[PDB]
Amino acid sequence: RKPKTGILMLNMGGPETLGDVHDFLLRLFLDQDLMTLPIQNKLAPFIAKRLTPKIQEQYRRIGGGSPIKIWTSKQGEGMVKLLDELSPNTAPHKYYIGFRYVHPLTEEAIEEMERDGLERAIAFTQYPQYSCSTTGSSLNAIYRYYNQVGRKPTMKWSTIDRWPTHHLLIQCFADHILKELDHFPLEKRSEVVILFSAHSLPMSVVNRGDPYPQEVSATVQKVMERLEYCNPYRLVWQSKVGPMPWLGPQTDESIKGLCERGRKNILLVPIAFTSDCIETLYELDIEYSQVLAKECGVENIRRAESLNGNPLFSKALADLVHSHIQSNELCSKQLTLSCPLCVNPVCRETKSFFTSQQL
Amino acid sequence: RKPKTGILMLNMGGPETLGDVHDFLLRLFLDQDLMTLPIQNKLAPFIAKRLTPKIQEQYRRIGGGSPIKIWTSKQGEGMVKLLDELSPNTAPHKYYIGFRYVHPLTEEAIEEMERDGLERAIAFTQYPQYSCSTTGSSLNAIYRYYNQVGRKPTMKWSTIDRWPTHHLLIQCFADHILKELDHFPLEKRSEVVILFSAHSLPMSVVNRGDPYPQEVSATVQKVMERLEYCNPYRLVWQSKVGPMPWLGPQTDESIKGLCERGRKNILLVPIAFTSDCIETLYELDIEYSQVLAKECGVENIRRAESLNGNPLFSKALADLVHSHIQSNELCSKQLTLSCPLCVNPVCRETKSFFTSQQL
Numbered sequence: 001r002k003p004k005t006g007i008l009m010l011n012m013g014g015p016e017t018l019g020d021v022h023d024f025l026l027r028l029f030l031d032q033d034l035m036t037l038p039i040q041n042k043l044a045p046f047i048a049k050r051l052t053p054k055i056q057e058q059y060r061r062i063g064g065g066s067p068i069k070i071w072t073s074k075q076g077e078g079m080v081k082l083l084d085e086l087s088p089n090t091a092p093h094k095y096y097i098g099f100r101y102v103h104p105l106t107e108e109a110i111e112e113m114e115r116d117g118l119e120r121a122i123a124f125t126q127y128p129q130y131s132c133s134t135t136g137s138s139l140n141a142i143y144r145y146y147n148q149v150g151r152k153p154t155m156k157w158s159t160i161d162r163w164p165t166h167h168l169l170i171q172c173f174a175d176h177i178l179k180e181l182d183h184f185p186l187e188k189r190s191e192v193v194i195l196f197s198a199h200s201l202p203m204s205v206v207n208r209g210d211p212y213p214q215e216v217s218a219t220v221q222k223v224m225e226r227l228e229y230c231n232p233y234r235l236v237w238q239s240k241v242g243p244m245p246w247l248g249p250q251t252d253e254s255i256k257g258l259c260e261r262g263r264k265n266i267l268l269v270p271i272a273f274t275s276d277c278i279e280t281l282y283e284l285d286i287e288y289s290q291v292l293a294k295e296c297g298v299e300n301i302r303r304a305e306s307l308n309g310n311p312l313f314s315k316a317l318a319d320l321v322h323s324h325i326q327s328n329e330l331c332s333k334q335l336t337l338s339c340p341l342c343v344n345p346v347c348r349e350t351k352s353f354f355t356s357q358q359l
Numbered sequence: 360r361k362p363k364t365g366i367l368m369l370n371m372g373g374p375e376t377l378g379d380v381h382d383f384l385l386r387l388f389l390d391q392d393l394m395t396l397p398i399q400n401k402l403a404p405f406i407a408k409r410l411t412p413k414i415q416e417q418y419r420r421i422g423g424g425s426p427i428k429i430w431t432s433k434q435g436e437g438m439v440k441l442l443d444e445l446s447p448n449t450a451p452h453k454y455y456i457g458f459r460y461v462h463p464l465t466e467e468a469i470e471e472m473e474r475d476g477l478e479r480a481i482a483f484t485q486y487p488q489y490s491c492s493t494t495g496s497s498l499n500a501i502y503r504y505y506n507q508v509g510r511k512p513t514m515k516w517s518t519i520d521r522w523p524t525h526h527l528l529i530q531c532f533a534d535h536i537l538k539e540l541d542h543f544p545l546e547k548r549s550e551v552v553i554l555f556s557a558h559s560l561p562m563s564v565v566n567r568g569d570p571y572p573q574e575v576s577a578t579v580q581k582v583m584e585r586l587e588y589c590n591p592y593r594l595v596w597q598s599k600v601g602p603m604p605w606l607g608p609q610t611d612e613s614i615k616g617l618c619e620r621g622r623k624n625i626l627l628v629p630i631a632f633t634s635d636c637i638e639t640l641y642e643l644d645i646e647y648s649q650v651l652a653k654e655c656g657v658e659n660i661r662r663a664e665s666l667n668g669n670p671l672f673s674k675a676l677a678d679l680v681h682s683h684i685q686s687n688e689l690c691s692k693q694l695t696l697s698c699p700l701c702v703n704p705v706c707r708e709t710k711s712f713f714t715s716q717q718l
């Protein structure tokens with residue numbers, strides 16, 4: 001009955017209520033792995049306070065908070081139930097949520113796992129495609145926790161640091177895309193253009209060698225092959241903020257561009273998220289699909305449902321862990337190679353932390 | 360006996376001798392599809408002249424000329440030999456080379472195809488990954504040829520505008536990668552880091568929605584899957600020129616970056632080319648693998664052999680054409696969707712030229 005194998009589900013997380021917004025932003029602006037700011041300890045809390053109002057408003061517009069925890073929990077539960085049957089030898093299994101900027105924090109999760117006296121610990125990022133700013137930071141967090149708690153782990157660690165083309169993940173996306181195409185007016189099904197939308201990155205991060213763009217592109221190709229290229233598409237990027245150069249084309253500008261050129265039936269696909277979040281419920285659904293779409297005279301714009309509670313996604317999670325345990329993988333081969341132009345000394349240390357694990 | 364089906368092999372081409380360098384550049388700077396310059400008719404010849412000496416020197420350093428035509432010819436021959444046996448209904452088959460900036464020019468080829476009284480004409484781009492500046496411009500040249508010659512085609516046209524993941528193309532790359540790995544000292548085989556190198560694009564082109572990046576990424580993923588992720592990798596871009604922002608990371612900077620970070624065994628892979636060219640024999644082999652490599656302290660840097668005369672590549676070409684004929688494809692579904700921010704009015708017209716083709 002005592003938990004044996006723990007599955008740490010890593011994700012950035014999102015504020016559950018409006019009151020959680022400020023601290024969310026604060027923890028984020030204090031993360032060196034994500035950004036280096038002048039007098040950061042002073043500006044971090046300041047920027048957080050000045051952005052809180054506007055960000056609280058965005059969450060109010062979607063109902064008052066982020067559903068990430070809810071969806072993550074349901075996905076974890078399904079995953080566990082399947083693992084206890086798939087791998088009796090490693091059962092019982094228990095999932096732990098390790099959010100990067102909100103409770104339960106990555107550090108609180110690890111602390112709970114250590115107290116539960118697990119034998120095996122698996123860092124399972126929830127970002128199918130790897131980015132040093134997301135999965136990397138989350139993995140860095142695990143290494144720093146021990147390096148700071150002044151004591152070696154009491155569990156055997158390993159990590160599933162990426163999984164951009166897992167067949168069940170691809171199937172989930174393909175299934176959701178198809179059912180959504182069925183929602184368009186019959187007369188426009190074939191005319192529908194698919195815009196796969198992933199989170200954009202500043203060009204400064206892309207240019208240092210971030211793995212993200214290339215992996216996201218792989219997921220896209222995999223999904224389209226499964227769809228037998230029934231509709232034309234383009235991979236675009238959303239969430240750019242600030243005046244600096246980011247990887248484009250931008251999702252909003254692409255939507256507007258398509259309309260001005262006669263392609264008024266668009267299908268958006270949140271290809272790099274596993275559940276609804278502010279990026280889908282507000283940015284894509286309200287900001288672009290309601291406001292922008294109107295001004296551009298779109299005829300039909302829809303978004304494929306987020307993976308959320310699809311039972312197939314949980315199976316995907318279970319299959320990944322199961323196959324990870326069976327192969328004795330400590331981490332992907334990809335993690336053993338840091339960005340050619342990486343300037344963060346912790347990246348190499350985090351890699352070694354995992355590649356060096358006993359077992 | 361007389362040719363029935365003609366396969367137009369499209370490629371930019373390269374100057375065969377140092378003397379061909381000037382006109383090569385001249386034709387290129389005069390292509391509106393590739394770039395728009397102020398007083399272009401006056402500047403094109405001027406720029407061509409000022410770059411000629413440096414570019415001629417580059418070709419001198421690799422032996423005095425570009426091997427693109429020789430390799431294209433051999434590949435076309437193998438393709439035809441196979442098609443005459445694979446698709447008897449469409450035989451005899453004949454291949455025609457349509458270089459965009461050197462003889463035989465795309466226009467000269469079409470002219471010859473007409474004169475041969477072919478029944479079927481297939482525009483077969485030799486760029487597996489689609490870019491509006493390469494395949495797009497080449498397809499644009501075909502539409503413009505008829506629109507300016509004031510006459511409708513006398514052959515039924517169609518196009519294989521892309522093939523980033525054809526399984527035989529993938530095996531060819533995977534095969535050349537493996538045998539190149541066998542050339543590294545055994546002790547360092549597993550330490551080898553793979554740098555897939557593709558031609559970079561200016562961000563202005565990337566941001567308007569160019570299909571290139573995403574498709575190149577697909578080829579990389581497929582190849583790595585076939586290699587079962589034996590070595591870690593990163594997709595980088597070469598050939599940036601000028602001071603404007605281009606899509607990185609840059610191949611030269613990545614090589615240098617890897618070295619100063621302790622990864623001194625590098626394998627370069629020209630993932631977006633089908634034969635050797637100045638980009639491989641000079642840029643990668645001399646500029647990077649000899650000069651840059653020396654100054655950086657590399658232990659071992661090699662480059663997977665270009666597809667060139669590999670019989671499997673010819674097979675790939677033949678099967679692509681075969682399947683294309685069997686399915687009645689006029690063009691890919693992707694060609695029916697122009698870039699969201701396309702500003703070239705001819706792109707839409709070229710697309711219609713193919714989608715509206717009789718039969």
Ligand SMILES: C[C@H](CCC(=O)O)[C@H]1CC[C@H]2[C@@H]3[C@H](O)C[C@@H]4C[C@H](O)CC[C@]4(C)[C@H]3C[C@H](O)[C@]12C
Nearest residue numbers: 035036037038039040043044046047048050242
């Ligand atoms: C200089 C630094 C960016 C450094 C870099 O990576 O080049 C930027 C990032 C966020 C900026 C701050 C945020 O925009 C918040 C404030 C905005 C005000 O207009 C100036 C002060 C202000 C406090 C800015 C100071 C400075 O320009 C910051 C700190």
Ligand SMILES: C[C@H](CCC(=O)O)[C@H]1CC[C@H]2[C@@H]3[C@H](O)C[C@@H]4C[C@H](O)CC[C@]4(C)[C@H]3C[C@H](O)[C@]12C
Nearest residue numbers: 025028034055131133134200201202205239241
């Ligand atoms: C740009 C960066 C990712 C960089 C990278 O991948 O290298 C992402 C990670 C988390 C993001 C931030 C978080 O989502 C929190 C804020 C969300 C707001 O909608 C925009 C500002 C906001 C402050 C975001 C700015 C930017 O998009 C961040 C900082």
Ligand SMILES: C[C@H](CCC(=O)O)[C@H]1CC[C@H]2[C@@H]3[C@H](O)C[C@@H]4C[C@H](O)CC[C@]4(C)[C@H]3C[C@H](O)[C@]12C
Nearest residue numbers: 034035036047050051202204241242243244245
């Ligand atoms: C827009 C916001 C400041 C808002 C404000 O002044 O109220 C600032 C604060 C910190 C900034 C980020 C950090 O400077 C880190 C990154 C710096 C890059 O040059 C752009 C992306 C980058 C991710 C920035 C995006 C954006 O401009 C941020 C998120």
Ligand SMILES: C[C@H](CCC(=O)O)[C@H]1CC[C@H]2[C@@H]3[C@H](O)C[C@@H]4C[C@H](O)CC[C@]4(C)[C@H]3C[C@H](O)[C@]12C
Nearest residue numbers: 394395396397398399402405406409563601603
């Ligand atoms: C202005 C234009 C780029 C416009 C654009 O992309 O927005 C650039 C493209 C190529 C440039 C030219 C080429 O670099 C060749 C010449 C270089 C000299 O240093 C200036 C004149 C010169 C003749 C340049 C004039 C101008 O800056 C040009 C014509």
Ligand SMILES: C[C@H](CCC(=O)O)[C@H]1CC[C@H]2[C@@H]3[C@H](O)C[C@@H]4C[C@H](O)CC[C@]4(C)[C@H]3C[C@H](O)[C@]12C
Nearest residue numbers: 387393414490491492493559560561564598600
């Ligand atoms: C940048 C452009 C592709 C743009 C795009 O994909 O949109 C490519 C296509 C052909 C290229 C040019 C041709 O290769 C001819 C020249 C080759 C030299 O090594 C650099 C200058 C040179 C003049 C190249 C400049 C640039 O890289 C070009 C113009």
Ligand SMILES: C[C@H](CCC(=O)O)[C@H]1CC[C@H]2[C@@H]3[C@H](O)C[C@@H]4C[C@H](O)CC[C@]4(C)[C@H]3C[C@H](O)[C@]12C
Nearest residue numbers: 393394395396406409410561563600601602603
């Ligand atoms: C470098 C070369 C001029 C060389 C010279 O004057 O000696 C110039 C001439 C035309 C330029 C190109 C054209 O301006 C078209 C493109 C403009 C984009 O802003 C950069 C890429 C882009 C493809 C340019 C690359 C490069 O700067 C070129 C090729």
Ligand code: FES
Nearest residue numbers: 132338339342347
């Ligand atoms: S920034 Fe990518 S490994 Fe360090």
Ligand code: FES
Nearest residue numbers: 491697698701706
């Ligand atoms: S520039 Fe891409 S279709 Fe016109």
